[PDB]
Every structure is written in structure tokens, then in C-alpha cells.
JSON list of C-alpha atoms in Angstrom, two decimals:
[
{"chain": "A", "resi": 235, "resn": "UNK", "atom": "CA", "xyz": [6.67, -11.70, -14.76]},
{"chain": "A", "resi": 236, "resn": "UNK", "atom": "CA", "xyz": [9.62, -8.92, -14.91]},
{"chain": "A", "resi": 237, "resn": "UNK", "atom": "CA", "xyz": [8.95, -8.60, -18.42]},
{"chain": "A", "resi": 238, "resn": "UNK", "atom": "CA", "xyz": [5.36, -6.78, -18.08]},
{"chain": "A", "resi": 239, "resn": "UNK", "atom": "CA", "xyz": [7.18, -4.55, -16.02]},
{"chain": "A", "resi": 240, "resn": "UNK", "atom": "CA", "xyz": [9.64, -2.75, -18.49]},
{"chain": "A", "resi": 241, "resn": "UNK", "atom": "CA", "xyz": [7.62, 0.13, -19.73]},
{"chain": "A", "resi": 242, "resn": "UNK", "atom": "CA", "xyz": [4.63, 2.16, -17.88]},
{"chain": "A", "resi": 243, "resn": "UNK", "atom": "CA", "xyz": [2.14, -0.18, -16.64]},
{"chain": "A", "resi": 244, "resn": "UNK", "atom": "CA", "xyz": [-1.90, 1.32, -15.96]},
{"chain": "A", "resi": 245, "resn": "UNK", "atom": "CA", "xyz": [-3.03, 1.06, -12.51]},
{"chain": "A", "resi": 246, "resn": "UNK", "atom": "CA", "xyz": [-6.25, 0.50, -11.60]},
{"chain": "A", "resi": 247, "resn": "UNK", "atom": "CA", "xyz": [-7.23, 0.18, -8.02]},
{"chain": "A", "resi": 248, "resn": "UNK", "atom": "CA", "xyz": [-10.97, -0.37, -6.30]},
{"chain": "A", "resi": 249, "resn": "UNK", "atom": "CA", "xyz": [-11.14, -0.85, -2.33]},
{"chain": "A", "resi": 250, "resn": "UNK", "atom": "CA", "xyz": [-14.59, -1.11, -0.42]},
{"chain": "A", "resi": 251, "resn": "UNK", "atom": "CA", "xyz": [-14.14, -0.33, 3.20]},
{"chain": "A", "resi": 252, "resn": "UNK", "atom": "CA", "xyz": [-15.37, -0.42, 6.76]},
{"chain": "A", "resi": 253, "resn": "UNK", "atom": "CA", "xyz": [-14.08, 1.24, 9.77]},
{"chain": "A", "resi": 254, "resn": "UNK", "atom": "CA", "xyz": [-16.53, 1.14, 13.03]},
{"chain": "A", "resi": 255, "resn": "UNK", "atom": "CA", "xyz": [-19.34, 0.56, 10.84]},
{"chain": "A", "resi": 256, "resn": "UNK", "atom": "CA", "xyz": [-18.40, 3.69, 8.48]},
{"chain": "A", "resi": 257, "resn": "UNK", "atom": "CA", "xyz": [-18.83, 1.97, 5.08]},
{"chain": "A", "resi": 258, "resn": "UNK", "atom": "CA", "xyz": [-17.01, 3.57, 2.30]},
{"chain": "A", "resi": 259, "resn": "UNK", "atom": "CA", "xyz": [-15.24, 3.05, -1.25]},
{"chain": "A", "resi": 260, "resn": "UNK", "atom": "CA", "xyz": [-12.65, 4.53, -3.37]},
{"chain": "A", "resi": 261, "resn": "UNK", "atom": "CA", "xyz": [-11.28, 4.22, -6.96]},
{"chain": "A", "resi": 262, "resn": "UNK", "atom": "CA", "xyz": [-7.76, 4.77, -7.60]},
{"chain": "A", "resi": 263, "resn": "UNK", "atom": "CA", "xyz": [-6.06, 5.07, -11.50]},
{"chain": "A", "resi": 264, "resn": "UNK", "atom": "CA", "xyz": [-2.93, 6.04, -12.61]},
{"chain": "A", "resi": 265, "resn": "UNK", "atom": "CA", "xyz": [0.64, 4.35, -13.79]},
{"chain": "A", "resi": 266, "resn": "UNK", "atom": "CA", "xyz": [3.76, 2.64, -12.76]},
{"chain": "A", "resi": 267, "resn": "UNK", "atom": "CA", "xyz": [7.33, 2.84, -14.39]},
{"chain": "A", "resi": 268, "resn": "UNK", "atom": "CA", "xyz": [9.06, -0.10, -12.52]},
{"chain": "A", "resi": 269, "resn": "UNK", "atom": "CA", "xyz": [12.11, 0.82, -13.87]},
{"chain": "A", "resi": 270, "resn": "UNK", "atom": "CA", "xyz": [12.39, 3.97, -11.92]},
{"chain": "A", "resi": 271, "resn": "UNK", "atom": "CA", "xyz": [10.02, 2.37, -8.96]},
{"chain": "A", "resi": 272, "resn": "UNK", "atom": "CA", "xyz": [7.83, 5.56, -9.91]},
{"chain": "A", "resi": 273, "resn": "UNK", "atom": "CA", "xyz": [3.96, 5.83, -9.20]},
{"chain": "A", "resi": 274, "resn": "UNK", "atom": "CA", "xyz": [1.94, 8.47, -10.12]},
{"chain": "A", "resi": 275, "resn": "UNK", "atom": "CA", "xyz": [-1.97, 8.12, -8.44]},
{"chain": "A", "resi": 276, "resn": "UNK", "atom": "CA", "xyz": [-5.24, 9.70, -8.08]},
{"chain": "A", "resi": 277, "resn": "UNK", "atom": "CA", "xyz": [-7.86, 8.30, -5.71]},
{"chain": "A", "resi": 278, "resn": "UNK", "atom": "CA", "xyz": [-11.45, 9.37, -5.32]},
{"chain": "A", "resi": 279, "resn": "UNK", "atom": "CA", "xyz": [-13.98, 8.46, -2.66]},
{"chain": "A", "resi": 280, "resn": "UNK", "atom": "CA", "xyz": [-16.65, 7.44, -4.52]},
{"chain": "A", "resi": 281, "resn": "UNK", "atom": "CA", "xyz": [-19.12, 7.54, -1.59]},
{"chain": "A", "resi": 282, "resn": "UNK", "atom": "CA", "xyz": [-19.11, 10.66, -0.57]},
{"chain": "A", "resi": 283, "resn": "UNK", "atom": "CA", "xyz": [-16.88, 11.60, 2.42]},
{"chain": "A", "resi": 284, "resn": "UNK", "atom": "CA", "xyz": [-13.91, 9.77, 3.42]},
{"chain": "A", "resi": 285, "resn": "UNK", "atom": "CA", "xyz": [-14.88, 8.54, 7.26]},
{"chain": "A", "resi": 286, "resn": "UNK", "atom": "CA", "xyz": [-10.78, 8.33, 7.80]},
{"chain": "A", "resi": 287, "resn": "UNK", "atom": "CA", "xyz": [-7.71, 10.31, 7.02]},
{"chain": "A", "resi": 288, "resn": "UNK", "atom": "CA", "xyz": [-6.72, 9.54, 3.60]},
{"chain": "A", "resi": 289, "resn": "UNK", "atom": "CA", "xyz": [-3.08, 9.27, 4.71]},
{"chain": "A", "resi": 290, "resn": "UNK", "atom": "CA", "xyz": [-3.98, 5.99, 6.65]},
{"chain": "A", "resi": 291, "resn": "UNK", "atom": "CA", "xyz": [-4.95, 4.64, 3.71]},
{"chain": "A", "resi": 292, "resn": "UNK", "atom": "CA", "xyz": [-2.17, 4.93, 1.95]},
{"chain": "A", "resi": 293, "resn": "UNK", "atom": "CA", "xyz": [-0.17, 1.85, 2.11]},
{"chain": "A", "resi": 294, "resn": "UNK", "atom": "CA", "xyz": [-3.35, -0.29, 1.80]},
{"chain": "A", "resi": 295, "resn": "UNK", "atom": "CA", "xyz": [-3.89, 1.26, -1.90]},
{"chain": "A", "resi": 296, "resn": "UNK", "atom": "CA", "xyz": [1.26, -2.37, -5.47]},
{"chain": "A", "resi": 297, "resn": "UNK", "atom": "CA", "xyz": [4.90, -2.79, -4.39]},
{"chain": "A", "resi": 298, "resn": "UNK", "atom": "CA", "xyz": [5.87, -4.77, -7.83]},
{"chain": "A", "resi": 299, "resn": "UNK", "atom": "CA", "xyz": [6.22, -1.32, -9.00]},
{"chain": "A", "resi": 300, "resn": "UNK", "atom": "CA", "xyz": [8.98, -1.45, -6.88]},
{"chain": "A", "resi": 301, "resn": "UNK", "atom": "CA", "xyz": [12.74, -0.65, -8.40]},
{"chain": "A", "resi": 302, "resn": "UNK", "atom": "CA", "xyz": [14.64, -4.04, -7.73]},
{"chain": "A", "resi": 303, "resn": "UNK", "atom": "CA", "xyz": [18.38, -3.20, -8.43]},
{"chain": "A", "resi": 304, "resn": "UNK", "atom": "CA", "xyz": [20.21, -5.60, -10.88]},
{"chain": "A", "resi": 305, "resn": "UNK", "atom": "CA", "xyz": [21.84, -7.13, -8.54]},
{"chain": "A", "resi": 306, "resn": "UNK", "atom": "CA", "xyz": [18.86, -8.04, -6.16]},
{"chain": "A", "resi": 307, "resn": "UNK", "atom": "CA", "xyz": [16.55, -9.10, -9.46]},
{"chain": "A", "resi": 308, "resn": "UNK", "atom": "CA", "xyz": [16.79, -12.64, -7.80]},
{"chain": "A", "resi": 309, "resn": "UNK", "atom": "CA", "xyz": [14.85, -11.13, -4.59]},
{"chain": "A", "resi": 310, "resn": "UNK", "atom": "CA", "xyz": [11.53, -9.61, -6.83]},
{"chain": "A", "resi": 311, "resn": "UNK", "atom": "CA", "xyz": [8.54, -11.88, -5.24]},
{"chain": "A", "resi": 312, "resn": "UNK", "atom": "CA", "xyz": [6.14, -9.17, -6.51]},
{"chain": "A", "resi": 313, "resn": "UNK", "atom": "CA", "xyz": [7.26, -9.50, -10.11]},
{"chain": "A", "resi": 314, "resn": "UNK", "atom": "CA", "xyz": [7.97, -12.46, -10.06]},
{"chain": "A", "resi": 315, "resn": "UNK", "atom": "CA", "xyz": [3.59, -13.88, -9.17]},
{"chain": "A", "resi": 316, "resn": "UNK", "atom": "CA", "xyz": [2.67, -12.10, -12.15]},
{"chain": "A", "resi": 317, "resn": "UNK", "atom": "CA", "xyz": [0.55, -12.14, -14.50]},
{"chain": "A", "resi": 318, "resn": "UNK", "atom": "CA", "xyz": [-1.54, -14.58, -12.37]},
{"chain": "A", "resi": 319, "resn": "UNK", "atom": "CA", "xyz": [-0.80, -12.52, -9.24]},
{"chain": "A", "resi": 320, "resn": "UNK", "atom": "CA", "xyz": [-0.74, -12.30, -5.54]},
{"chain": "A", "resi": 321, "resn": "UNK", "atom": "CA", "xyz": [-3.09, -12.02, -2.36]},
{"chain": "A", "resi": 322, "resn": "UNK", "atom": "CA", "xyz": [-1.56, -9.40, 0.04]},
{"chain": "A", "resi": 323, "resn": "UNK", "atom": "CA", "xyz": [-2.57, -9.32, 3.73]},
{"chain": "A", "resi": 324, "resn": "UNK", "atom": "CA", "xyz": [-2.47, -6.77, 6.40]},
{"chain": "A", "resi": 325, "resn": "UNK", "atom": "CA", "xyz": [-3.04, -6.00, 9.92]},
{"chain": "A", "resi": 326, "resn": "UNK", "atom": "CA", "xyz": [-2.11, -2.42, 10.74]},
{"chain": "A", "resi": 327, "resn": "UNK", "atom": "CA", "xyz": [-2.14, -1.79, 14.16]},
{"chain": "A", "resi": 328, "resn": "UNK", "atom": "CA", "xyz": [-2.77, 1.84, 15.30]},
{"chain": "A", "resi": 329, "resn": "UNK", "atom": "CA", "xyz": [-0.82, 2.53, 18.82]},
{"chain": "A", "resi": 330, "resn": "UNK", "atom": "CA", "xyz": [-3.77, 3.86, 21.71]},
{"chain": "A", "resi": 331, "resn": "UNK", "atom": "CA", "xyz": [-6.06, 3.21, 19.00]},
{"chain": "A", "resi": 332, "resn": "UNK", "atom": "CA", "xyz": [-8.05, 0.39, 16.80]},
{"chain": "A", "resi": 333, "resn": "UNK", "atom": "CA", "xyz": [-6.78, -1.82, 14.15]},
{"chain": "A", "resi": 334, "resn": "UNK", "atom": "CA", "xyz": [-7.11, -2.39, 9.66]},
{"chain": "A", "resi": 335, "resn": "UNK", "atom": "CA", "xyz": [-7.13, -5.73, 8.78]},
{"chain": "A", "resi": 336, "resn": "UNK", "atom": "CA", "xyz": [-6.54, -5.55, 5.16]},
{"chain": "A", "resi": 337, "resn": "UNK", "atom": "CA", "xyz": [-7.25, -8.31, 2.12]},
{"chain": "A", "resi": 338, "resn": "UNK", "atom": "CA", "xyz": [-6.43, -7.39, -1.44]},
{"chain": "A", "resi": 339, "resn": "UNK", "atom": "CA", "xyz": [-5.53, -9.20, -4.91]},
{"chain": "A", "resi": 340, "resn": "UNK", "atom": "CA", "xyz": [-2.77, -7.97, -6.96]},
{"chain": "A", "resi": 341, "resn": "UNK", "atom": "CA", "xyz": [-3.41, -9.08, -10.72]},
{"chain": "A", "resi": 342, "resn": "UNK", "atom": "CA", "xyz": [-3.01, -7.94, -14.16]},
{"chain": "A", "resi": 343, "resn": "UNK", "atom": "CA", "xyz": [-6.33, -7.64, -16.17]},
{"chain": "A", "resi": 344, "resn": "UNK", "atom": "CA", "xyz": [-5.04, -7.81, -19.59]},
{"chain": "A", "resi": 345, "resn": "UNK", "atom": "CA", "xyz": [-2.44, -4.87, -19.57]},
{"chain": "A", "resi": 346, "resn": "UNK", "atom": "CA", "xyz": [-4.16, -3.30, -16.68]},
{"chain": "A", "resi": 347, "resn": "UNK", "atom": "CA", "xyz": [-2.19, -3.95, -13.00]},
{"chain": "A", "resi": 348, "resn": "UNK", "atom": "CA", "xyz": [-5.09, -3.97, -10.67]},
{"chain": "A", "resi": 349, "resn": "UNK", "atom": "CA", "xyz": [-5.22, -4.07, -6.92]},
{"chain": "A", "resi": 350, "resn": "UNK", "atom": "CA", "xyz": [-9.02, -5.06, -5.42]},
{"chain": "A", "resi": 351, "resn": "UNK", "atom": "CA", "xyz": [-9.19, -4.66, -1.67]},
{"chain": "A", "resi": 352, "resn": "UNK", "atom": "CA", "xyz": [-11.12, -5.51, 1.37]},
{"chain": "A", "resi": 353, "resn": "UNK", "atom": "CA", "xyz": [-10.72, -3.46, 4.20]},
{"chain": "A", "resi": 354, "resn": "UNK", "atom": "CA", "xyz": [-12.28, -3.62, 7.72]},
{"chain": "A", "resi": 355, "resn": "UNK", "atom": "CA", "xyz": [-11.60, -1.55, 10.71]},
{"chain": "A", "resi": 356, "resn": "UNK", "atom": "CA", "xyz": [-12.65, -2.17, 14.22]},
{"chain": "A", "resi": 357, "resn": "UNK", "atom": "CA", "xyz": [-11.60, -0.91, 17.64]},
{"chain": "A", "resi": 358, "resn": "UNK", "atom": "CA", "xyz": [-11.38, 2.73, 17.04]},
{"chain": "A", "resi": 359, "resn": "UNK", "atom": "CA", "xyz": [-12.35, 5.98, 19.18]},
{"chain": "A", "resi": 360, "resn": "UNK", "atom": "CA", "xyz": [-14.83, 8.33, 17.46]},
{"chain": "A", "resi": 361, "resn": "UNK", "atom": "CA", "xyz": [-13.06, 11.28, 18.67]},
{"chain": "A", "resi": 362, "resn": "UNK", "atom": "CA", "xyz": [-9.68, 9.58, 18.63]},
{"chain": "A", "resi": 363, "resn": "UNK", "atom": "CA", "xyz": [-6.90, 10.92, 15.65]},
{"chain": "A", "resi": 364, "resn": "UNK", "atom": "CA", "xyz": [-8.40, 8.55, 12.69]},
{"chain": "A", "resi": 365, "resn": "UNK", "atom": "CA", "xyz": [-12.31, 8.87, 13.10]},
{"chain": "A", "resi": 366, "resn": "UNK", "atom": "CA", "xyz": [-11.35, 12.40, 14.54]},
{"chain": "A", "resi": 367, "resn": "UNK", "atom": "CA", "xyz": [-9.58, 13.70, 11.37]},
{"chain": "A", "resi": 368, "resn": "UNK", "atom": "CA", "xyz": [-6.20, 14.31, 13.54]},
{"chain": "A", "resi": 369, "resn": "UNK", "atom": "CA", "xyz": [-3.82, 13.39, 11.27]},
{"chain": "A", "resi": 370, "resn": "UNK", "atom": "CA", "xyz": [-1.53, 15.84, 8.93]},
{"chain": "A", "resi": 371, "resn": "UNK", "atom": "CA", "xyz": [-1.67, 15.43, 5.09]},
{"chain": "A", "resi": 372, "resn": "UNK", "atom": "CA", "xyz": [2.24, 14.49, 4.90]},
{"chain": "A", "resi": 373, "resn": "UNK", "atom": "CA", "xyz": [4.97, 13.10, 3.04]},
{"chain": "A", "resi": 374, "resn": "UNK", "atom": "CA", "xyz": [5.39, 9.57, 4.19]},
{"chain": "A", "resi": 375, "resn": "UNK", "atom": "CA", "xyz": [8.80, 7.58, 3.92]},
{"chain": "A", "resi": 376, "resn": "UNK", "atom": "CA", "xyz": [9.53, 4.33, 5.82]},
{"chain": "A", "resi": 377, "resn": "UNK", "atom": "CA", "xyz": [11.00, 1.46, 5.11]},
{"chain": "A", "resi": 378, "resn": "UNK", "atom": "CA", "xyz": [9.47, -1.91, 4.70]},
{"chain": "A", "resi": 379, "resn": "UNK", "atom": "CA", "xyz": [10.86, -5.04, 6.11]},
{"chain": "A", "resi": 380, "resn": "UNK", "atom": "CA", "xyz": [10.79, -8.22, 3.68]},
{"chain": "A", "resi": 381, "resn": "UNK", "atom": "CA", "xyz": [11.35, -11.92, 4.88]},
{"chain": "A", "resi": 382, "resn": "UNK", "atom": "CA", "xyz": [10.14, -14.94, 2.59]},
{"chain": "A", "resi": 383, "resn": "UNK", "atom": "CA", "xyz": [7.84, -16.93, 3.89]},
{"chain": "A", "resi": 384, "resn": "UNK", "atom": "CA", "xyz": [8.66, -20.66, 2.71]},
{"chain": "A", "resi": 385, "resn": "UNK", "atom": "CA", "xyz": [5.36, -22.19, 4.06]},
{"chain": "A", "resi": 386, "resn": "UNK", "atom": "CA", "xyz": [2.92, -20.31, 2.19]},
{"chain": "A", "resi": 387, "resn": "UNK", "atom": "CA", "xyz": [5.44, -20.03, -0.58]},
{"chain": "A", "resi": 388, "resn": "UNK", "atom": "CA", "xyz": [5.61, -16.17, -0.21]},
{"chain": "A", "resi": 389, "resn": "UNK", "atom": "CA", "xyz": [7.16, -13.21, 2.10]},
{"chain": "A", "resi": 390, "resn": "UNK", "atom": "CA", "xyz": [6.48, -11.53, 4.96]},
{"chain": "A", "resi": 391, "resn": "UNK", "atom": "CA", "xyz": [6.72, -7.65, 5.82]},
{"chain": "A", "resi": 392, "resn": "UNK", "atom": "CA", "xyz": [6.62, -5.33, 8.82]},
{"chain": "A", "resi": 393, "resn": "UNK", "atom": "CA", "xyz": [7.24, -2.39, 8.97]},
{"chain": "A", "resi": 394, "resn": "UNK", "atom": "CA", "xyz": [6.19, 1.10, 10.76]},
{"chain": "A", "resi": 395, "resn": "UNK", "atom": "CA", "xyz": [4.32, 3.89, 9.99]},
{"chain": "A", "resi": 396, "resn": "UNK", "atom": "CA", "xyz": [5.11, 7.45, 11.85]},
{"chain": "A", "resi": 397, "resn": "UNK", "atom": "CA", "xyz": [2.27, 9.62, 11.07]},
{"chain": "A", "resi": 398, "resn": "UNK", "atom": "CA", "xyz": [2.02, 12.97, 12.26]},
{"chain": "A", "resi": 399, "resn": "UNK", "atom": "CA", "xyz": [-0.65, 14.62, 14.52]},
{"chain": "A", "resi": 400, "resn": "UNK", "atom": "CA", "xyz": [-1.85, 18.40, 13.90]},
{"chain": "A", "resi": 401, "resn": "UNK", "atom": "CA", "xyz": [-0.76, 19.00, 17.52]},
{"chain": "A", "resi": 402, "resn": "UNK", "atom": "CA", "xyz": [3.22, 17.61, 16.42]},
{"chain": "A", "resi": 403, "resn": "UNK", "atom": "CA", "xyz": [2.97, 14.33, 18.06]},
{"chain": "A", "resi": 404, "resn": "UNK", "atom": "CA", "xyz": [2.94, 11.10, 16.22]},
{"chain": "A", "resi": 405, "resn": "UNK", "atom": "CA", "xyz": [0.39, 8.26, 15.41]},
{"chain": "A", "resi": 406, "resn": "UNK", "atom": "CA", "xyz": [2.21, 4.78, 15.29]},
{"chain": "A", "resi": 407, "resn": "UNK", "atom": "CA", "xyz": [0.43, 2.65, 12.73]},
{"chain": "A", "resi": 408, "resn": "UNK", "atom": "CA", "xyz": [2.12, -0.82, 13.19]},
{"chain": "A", "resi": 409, "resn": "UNK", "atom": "CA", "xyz": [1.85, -2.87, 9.68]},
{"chain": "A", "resi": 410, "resn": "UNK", "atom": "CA", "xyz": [2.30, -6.68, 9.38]},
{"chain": "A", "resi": 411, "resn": "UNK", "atom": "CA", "xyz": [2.00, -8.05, 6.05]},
{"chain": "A", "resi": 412, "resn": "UNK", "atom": "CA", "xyz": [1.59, -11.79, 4.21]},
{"chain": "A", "resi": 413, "resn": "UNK", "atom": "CA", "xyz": [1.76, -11.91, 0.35]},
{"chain": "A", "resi": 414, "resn": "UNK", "atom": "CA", "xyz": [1.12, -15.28, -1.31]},
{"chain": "A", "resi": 415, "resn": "UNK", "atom": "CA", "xyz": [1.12, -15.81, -5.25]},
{"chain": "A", "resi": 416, "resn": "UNK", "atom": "CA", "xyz": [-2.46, -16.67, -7.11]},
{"chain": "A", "resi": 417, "resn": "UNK", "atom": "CA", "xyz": [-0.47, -19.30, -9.29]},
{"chain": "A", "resi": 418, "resn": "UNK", "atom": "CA", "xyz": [1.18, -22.38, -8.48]},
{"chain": "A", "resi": 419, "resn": "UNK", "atom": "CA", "xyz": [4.43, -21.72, -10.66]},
{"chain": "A", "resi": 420, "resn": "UNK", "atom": "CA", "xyz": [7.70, -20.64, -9.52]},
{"chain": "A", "resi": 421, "resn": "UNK", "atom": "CA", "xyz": [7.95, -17.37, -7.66]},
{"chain": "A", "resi": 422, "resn": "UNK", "atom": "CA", "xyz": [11.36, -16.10, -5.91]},
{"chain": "A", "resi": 423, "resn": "UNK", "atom": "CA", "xyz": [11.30, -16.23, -2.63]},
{"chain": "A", "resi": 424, "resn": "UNK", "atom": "CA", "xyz": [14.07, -13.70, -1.37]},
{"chain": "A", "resi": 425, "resn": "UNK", "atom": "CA", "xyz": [16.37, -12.75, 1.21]},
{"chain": "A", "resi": 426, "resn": "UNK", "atom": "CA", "xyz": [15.63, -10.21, 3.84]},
{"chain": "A", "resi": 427, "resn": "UNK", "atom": "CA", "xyz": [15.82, -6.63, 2.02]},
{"chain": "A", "resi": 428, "resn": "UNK", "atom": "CA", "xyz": [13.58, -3.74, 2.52]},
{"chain": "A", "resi": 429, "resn": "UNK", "atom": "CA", "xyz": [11.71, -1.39, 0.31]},
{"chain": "A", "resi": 430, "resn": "UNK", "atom": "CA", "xyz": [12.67, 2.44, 0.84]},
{"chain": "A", "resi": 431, "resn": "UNK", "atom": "CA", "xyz": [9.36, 4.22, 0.03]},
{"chain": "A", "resi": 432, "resn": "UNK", "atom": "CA", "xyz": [8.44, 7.30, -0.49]},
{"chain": "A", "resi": 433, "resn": "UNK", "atom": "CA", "xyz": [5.09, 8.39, -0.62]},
{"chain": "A", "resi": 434, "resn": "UNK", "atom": "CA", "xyz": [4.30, 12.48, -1.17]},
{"chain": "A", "resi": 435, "resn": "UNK", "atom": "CA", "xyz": [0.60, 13.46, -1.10]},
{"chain": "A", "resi": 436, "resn": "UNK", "atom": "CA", "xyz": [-1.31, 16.63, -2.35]},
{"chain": "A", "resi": 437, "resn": "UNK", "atom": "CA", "xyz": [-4.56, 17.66, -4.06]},
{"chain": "A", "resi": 438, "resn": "UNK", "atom": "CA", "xyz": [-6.03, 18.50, -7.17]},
{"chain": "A", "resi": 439, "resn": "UNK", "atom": "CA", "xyz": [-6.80, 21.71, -7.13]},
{"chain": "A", "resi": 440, "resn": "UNK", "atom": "CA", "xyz": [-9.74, 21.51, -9.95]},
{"chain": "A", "resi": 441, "resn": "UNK", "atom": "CA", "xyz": [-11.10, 18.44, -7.90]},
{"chain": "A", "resi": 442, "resn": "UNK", "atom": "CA", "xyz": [-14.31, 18.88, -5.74]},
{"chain": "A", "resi": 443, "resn": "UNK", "atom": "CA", "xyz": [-14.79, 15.05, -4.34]},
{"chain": "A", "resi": 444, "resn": "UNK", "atom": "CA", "xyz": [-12.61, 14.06, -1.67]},
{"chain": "A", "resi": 445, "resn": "UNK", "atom": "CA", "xyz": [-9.36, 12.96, -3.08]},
{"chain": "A", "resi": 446, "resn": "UNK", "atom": "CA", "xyz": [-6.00, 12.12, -2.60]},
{"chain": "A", "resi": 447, "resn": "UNK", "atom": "CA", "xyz": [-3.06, 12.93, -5.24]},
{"chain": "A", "resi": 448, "resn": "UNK", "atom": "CA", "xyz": [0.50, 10.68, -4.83]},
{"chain": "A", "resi": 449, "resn": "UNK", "atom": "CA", "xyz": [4.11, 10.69, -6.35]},
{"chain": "A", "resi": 450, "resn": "UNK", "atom": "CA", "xyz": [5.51, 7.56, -4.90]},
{"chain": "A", "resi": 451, "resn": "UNK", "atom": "CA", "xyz": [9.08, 6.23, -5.18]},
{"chain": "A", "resi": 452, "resn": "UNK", "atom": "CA", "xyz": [10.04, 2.44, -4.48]},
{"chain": "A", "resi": 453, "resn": "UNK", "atom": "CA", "xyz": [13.33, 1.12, -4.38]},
{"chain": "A", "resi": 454, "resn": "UNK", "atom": "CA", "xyz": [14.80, -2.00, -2.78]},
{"chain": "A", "resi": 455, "resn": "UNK", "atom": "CA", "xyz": [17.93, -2.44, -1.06]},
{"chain": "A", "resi": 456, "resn": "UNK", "atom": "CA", "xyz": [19.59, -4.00, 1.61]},
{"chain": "A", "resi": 457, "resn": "UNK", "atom": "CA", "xyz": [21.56, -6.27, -0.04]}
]
């Protein structure tokens, strides 16, 4: 699977979501240069409005993009599922607030990497800091947590995401993660390493639908 991975890979991304009963879909294109763990991405609500802050969406819209040193090539599960892919799994957990649970399928289509989600989110106050429209449009850099998960033959994640209020304070969104392959072949299953991410968001300035711009940088270490 490393070996689609060399050049600049298209992205293609499609998620239809529901938080509180606020139905909603975006479309996401761009590319990937795994070699430099680069991402470059533009999403567009394709519905109209987006009923939460695009910055909590974030990690929910393709970590084999990630930049696995040499020397940790033997930890790439991502990679490593492809071209027949993987099902990745979330439950993000927003401190004093509701919860995402998250559902997507990581595949190539032909040369295309795409990423098809389900999300659904339940629990949340209407004038709280997500259905409110609290939350500052932000760099975002975190690391996330990887452990392999023998039994399903994949990894685990968890990791935590700091995300700033317009008053200063902070939003804790709490992410556990599950990624199994698609295929039954070999995938590595690694040690425990993280992914240092680094996510920096911005707009288009000739773009009238609601839209989010991202440079993202993924690198893995820990080993």
C-alpha cells in the first residue's frame, strides 16, 4: 500500500451529518503528498449553512497521508490497508457538552483517496459553544495517540482536542478512535507512536458558501 503513496495523491471526501436533528453535508477535495505528510483541503457545505463550527469537524474529515519516518515504516497501519482500505471509528466527546459518534471508509477509488463518512451528534445544548457558534476559527495541533488493536486486527487512538472559546476559555473535545482494514491481507499492526498534527484553517476569500480552507501537516514519531 506505501507505494500509492509516493507522489501527490487526490482527495476526495463526502460526509452527511446530523447533530440534534440539524441534518447537513459537506464535500471536501484536494491532495496529499505523504512524503512530506502535507494536505492541502477545501470543504464546502453543500446544504446551506453549517449547523456546527467547522473547526469541530475537522478531525472527522485521512491520516495515511501521514509522514511515517524510515525508521518507523514498519508502524504505517494506514498505508499499509490500502488500496482495499479501512473503516475508521470515532466517539468525540465534548466536555459540559454532547457527543460525535463518527463512521467513515477510507478507500482508494481508482487513483482517487476517498474518505465517506457518517456522522451523528446527540446530547448537545442549543445555546451551548457548538450549536451556539462559540468556538474560534484556529490553528489546531495535538497529538494523536496510536495503540494496535490485535483483536480487530487494527489500532486504536485517543487523543485530545483543546479548542478555543471566543471568550479565551477552552472546549475539550475528547476523541477515541478504532480503525480496522476493509481487506483480509496483511496490515502492520504497530507499536505505540503518535501522530504530531497540525491543522491551520482559513477562508477563501472569492468563496460565498460556507467553507473551510486547511494546510495540514502529519508526521509520526515516538519511536
Amino acid at each position: 500500500g506505501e507505494e500509492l503513496f509516493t507522489g501527490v495523491v487526490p482527495i476526495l471526501v463526502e460526509l452527511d451529518g446530523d447533530v440534534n436533528g440539524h441534518k447537513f453535508s459537506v464535500s471536501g477535495e484536494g491532495e496529499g503528498d505523504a512524503t512530506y505528510g502535507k494536505l492541502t483541503l477545501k470543504f464546502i457545505c453543500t446544504t446551506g449553512k453549517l449547523p456546527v463550527p467547522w473547526p469541530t469537524l475537522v478531525t472527522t474529515l485521512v491520516q495515511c497521508f501521514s509522514r511515517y519516518p524510515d525508521h518507523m515504516k514498519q508502524h504505517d497501519f494506514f498505508k499499509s490497508a490500502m488500496p482495499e482500505g479501512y473503516v475508521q471509528e470515532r466517539t468525540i466527546f465534548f466536555k459540559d457538552d454532547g457527543n460525535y459518534k463518527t463512521r467513515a471508509e477510507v478507500k482508494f477509488e481508482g487513483d482517487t483517496l476517498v474518505n465517506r463518512i457518517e456522522l451523528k451528534g446527540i446530547d448537545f445544548k442549543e445555546d451551548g459553544n457548538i450549536l451556539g457558534h462559540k468556538l474560534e476559527y484556529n490553528y489546531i495541533s495535538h497529538n494523536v495517540y496510536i495503540t494496535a488493536d490485535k483483536q480487530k486486527n487494527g489500532i486504536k487512538a485517543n487523543f485530545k482536542i483543546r479548542h478555543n472559546i471566543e471568550d479565551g476559555s477552552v472546549q475539550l473535545a475528547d476523541h477515541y478512535q478504532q480503525n480496522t482494514p476493509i481487506g483480509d491481507g496483511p496490515v502492520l499492526l504497530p507499536d505505540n507512536h503518535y501522530l504530531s498534527t497540525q491543522s491551520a484553517l482559513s477562508k477563501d476569500p472569492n468563496e460565498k458558501r460556507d467553507h473551510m480552507v486547511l494546510l495540514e501537516f502529519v508526521t509520526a514519531a515516538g519511536i
